């Protein structure tokens, strides 16, 4: 997936595209994730 935004923090809406094995979710939310993002392989 990808993240799009100006500052990618809690002060600005950011667009997130996540393509896991079943579907694609696109969320436009202002939630701040950590820099150098990661996705867990196993639960």
């Amino acid at each position: 997936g990808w993240i799009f935004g100006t500052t990618l923090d809690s002060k600005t809406q950011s667009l997130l595209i996540v393509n896991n094995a079943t579907n694609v979710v696109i969320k436009v939310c202002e939630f701040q994730f950590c820099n150098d993002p990661f996705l867990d392989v196993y639960y």
Partner: protein, 50 residues
Amino acid sequence: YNYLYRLFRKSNLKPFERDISTEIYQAGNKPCNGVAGFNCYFPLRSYGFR
């Protein structure tokens, strides 16, 4: 005073664009650092609607 409008930092909005950020607007050289003082004020203003 429920309805509010916006005053940006000489940045016109794009067509069909909406902002929600409520950071302190700066008009001078010094940073506001979250304090609304001289050349620093809250950009969201309320209508009268009387």
